[PDB]
Design an enzyme around this catalytic site. Structure first.
Site, mmCIF file in Angstrom:
data_model
loop_
_atom_site.group_PDB
_atom_site.id
_atom_site.type_symbol
_atom_site.label_atom_id
_atom_site.label_comp_id
_atom_site.label_asym_id
_atom_site.label_seq_id
_atom_site.Cartn_x
_atom_site.Cartn_y
_atom_site.Cartn_z
ATOM 1 N N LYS B 32 0.867 -1.180 0.000
ATOM 2 C CA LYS B 32 0.000 0.000 0.000
ATOM 3 C C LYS B 32 0.899 1.224 0.000
ATOM 4 C CE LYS B 32 -1.714 1.837 3.662
ATOM 5 N NZ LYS B 32 -2.471 2.126 4.907
ATOM 6 N N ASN B 33 1.983 1.131 0.770
ATOM 7 C CA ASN B 33 2.947 2.217 0.883
ATOM 8 C C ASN B 33 3.638 2.523 -0.442
ATOM 9 O OD1 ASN B 33 2.197 1.907 3.533
ATOM 10 N ND2 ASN B 33 4.234 1.332 4.291
ATOM 11 N N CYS B 127 -2.754 15.501 16.082
ATOM 12 C CA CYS B 127 -1.655 16.172 16.799
ATOM 13 C C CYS B 127 -0.426 15.306 17.175
ATOM 14 C CB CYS B 127 -2.215 16.917 18.030
ATOM 15 S SG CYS B 127 -3.207 15.909 19.183
ATOM 16 N N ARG B 132 3.588 12.392 11.068
ATOM 17 C CA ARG B 132 4.414 13.529 11.456
ATOM 18 C C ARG B 132 3.987 14.787 10.708
ATOM 19 N NH1 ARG B 132 10.616 11.674 12.603
ATOM 20 N NH2 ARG B 132 10.478 13.687 13.703
ATOM 21 N N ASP B 313 7.393 -0.093 10.931
ATOM 22 C CA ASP B 313 6.155 -0.831 10.638
ATOM 23 C C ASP B 313 6.168 -2.277 11.145
ATOM 24 O OD1 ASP B 313 5.115 1.483 9.561
ATOM 25 O OD2 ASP B 313 5.310 0.838 7.456
ATOM 26 N N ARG B 405 -7.084 -1.956 6.329
ATOM 27 C CA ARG B 405 -6.429 -0.861 5.610
ATOM 28 C C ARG B 405 -5.109 -1.267 4.962
ATOM 29 N NH1 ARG B 405 -7.752 4.425 9.353
ATOM 30 N NH2 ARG B 405 -5.795 3.866 10.385
HETATM 31 CL CL CL Z 1 -2.988 2.937 10.759
#
Ligand code: CL
Ligand code: CL
Lengths: 438, 438
Positions: B32-33, B127, B132, B313, B405
């Site tokens: 996905k990345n 936040c 980031r 990850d 996801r």
């Molecule tokens: Cl996530």
């Protein structure tokens, strides 16, 4: 429907073009200094759901909400209302690095100690002033039967049986007063806290603990007594208006020869400031506080003191009006003796000041000049912007992160008062043509 | 013929009965990345039609496709293939609320800035860590001649003449590296990006930009140089295998004393993980990576680092194998210092861990117990399921939205390896008789 917190871009600037007289009305939001403790206090309610209103849209609010969720409370924040369901089994650890970044995180220890019997929080670090040691907090919990410690960047407290006790605070600490008072609510027996902070935020918090079924009397005086009870129940509560923000706009009106109506402001919470401004020639009317600035300001000495004395949070801003007064004056700190990091920035604006001991000798009247200044802290950020309102030319204020920690839409409010102020990204600004803006 | 995205029912559960040894083969889908940036990059192609293959069936893919269609590109997604025709006049606005829900949406700014000269995207909000700040993205575009800003929940960038420039990244940001590199492809002049992310996904994206006619060298090293060109042309490209998913099944095999063959996996992309597992006693064979778990696991300390260091990850999942090792060990984050929200859930399973600073002290070997746990994020979801494989009894994992996801048919793959795992609707489950299932 939940509120979202949006980061701002690094290096944004507030550009002010001095010379404009402020006229109009300005509404105040809830105090940050009041909302954090109130939110933390919701952890004490083992029954019902808390409904907090008039909650300001600030970073620390979102952060504290995340801490409570991690402590196993269900939190919701929509518009200016926060809802807290702390009826579940509440945990006692707040150890993440983001917890350190928020210096006010320590406020959850009292409620946790009372509600669960233990509390562990990651310390923020730091050495000089702007903040003070947290020893008083531990002294109080220790007196109440807790085993405490500061180890590996963590402050912890555990109590097999939290009991009532007599505690004397070396100095009237707002933070310590808050933690000890909250912890006392569910302790077995009565707690007597001497030499406590008398600030309005303490009184509001006391009222809230009482609405939940606690027995707290004396808030606002030098002595608070708490008769511990078995359990507290949720209720509704509105956060009191931010008296400091009220002071900021009062000074802005006073230095620009303006006429501003500060709505939703409690004159009783800022008597010292009011009385001090009046000595300088400013007219203050309780219409709801209207401020009318005079042509000339009379020089006056100011000394910060614990409430009800002159507030340290108005110190940096008060120095601005002192610089414009006709003659020499002096500003002295007895609360935070090192809170003068903004003096070097005011000099860049042509200010004439000298730091001596825990006082600053101010040589007025100064003909302030626009310059590039960096905010050094929350109140200082606003102080520089106020100086910009009176400075000849354009003042560029950076390090807005500090301003955003306690002021919402500060530039927009000033614009509404007729001020030539703009908040732009660094990439939009071409120093050789600031006039372009506005 | 177009792929359809089907919603899952809220509160579904993955129930795992620990004690089973995993044996068999498992195929990995595209990362996905890697796919989101690749899809966004298709916007750079003013000629031809892009053909992307090995595209995983994930929510973010469908979402990004909708964004591109709104940007005036013709997109098609059938099976594991996505087709993109971006030869038309491409627009530059992605403002809908659904754009905020997908934190990765910011990836279209670079391509838009390069292709159209402007980009406006709705920010996701938030936040703490897990993500980031996006400051680096803007710093880079600003250096390239763009006027930028974050205003009203929107991040925008406009450039009259996007030019090449030297940019130094404060930290090796994957997102920033991707945007700046994509923007540089059509900028006038050369761009030098220092201290960039070296992750495999960055290298794959660089290869893709090159196949389209761009001139990008250095991907995989700490410095990337891009010589801007007038136009890019469409081509075909296959999304690299998901190295993280590969890591997840490696750990699953390692902790269950299994023998699993991970097909379509690039050992070079996960050297750090491999080397770390081997120190624990796990056998890793490059047959195409076969993993054989040992009877006992040797304790080992792990510290996340930017690639090629140990990947963040794999952090939550790596903690599972650390808990089962014979002795105390430590897990430290240097990439996302607050990514430990899953620790409280692992405790419910009888784990013994302590959060201290940006490290977690793990006291192994732990005798994990089945419990009701809530996933806190993508990798954490899988981590809990892995713990379930070794826990005594039944583990019920909720909040599957996070799992979905990034993992496709995760339960089915585990079943194929001989694991007692089931994914059921909440209404099917009768806690007093989980055995009924399976
Ligand atoms: Cl996530
Ligand atoms: Cl501050």
């Amino acid at each position: 429907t939940e509120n979202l917190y949006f980061q701002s871009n690094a290096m944004e600037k507030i550009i002010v073009r001095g010379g404009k007289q402020l006229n109009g009305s300005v509404k105040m939001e809830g105090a940050k200094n009041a909302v954090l403790p109130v939110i933390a206090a919701t952890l004490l309610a083992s029954k019902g759901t808390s409904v907090l209103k008039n909650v300001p849209n600030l970073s620390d609010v979102f952060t504290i909400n995340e801490v409570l969720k991690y402590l196993n409370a269900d939190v919701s924040f929509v518009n200016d209302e926060v809802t807290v369901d702390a009826t579940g089994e509440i945990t006692s650890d707040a150890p993440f690095e983001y917890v350190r970044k928020m210096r006010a995180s320590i406020v959850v220890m009292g409620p946790l100690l009372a509600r669960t019997g233990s509390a562990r929080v990651a310390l923020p670090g730091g050495c000089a002033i702007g903040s003070r040691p947290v020893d008083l907090h531990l002294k109080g919990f220790e007196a109440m039967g807790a085993v405490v410690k500061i180890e590996n960047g963590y402050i912890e407290a555990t109590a097999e049986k939290l009991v009532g006790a007599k505690v004397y605070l070396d100095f009237p600490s707002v933070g310590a007063t808050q933690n000890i008072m909250m912890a006392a609510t569910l302790a077995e027996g009565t707690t007597v806290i001497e030499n406590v902070a008398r600030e309005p935020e303490i009184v509001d918090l006391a009222n809230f603990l009482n609405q939940m079924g606690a027995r707290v009397i004396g808030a606002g005086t030098e002595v608070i007594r708490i008769e511990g009870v078995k359990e507290l129940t949720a209720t509704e509560h509105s956060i009191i208006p931010d008296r400091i923000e009220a002071g900021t706009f009062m000074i802005a009106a006073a230095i620009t020869g303006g006429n501003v109506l500060i709505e939703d402001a409690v004159p009783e919470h800022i008597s010292s400031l009011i009385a001090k401004l009046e000595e300088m020639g400013v007219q203050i009317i309780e219409e709801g506080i209207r401020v009318i600035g005079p042509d000339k300001l009379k020089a006056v000495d100011v000394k910060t003191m614990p409430h009800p004395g002159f507030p340290t949070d108005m110190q940096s801003q008060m120095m601005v009006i002192q610089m414009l007064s006709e003659g020499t004056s002096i500003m002295t700190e007895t609360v935070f003796e090192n809170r003068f990091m903004h003096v070097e920035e005011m000099r860049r604006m042509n200010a004439d000041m000298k730091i001596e001991g825990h006082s600053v000798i101010i040589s007025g009247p100064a003909k302030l000049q626009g310059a590039e200044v960096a905010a050094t802290d929350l109140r200082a950020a606003a102080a520089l912007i106020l100086a910009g309102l009176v400075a000849d030319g354009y003042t560029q204020v950076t390090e807005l992160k500090y301003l955003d920690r306690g002021y919402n839409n500060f530039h927009g409010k000033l614009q509404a008062l007729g001020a030539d102020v703009e908040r732009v990204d660094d990439s939009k600004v071409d120093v050789t043509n600031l006039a372009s803006l506005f």
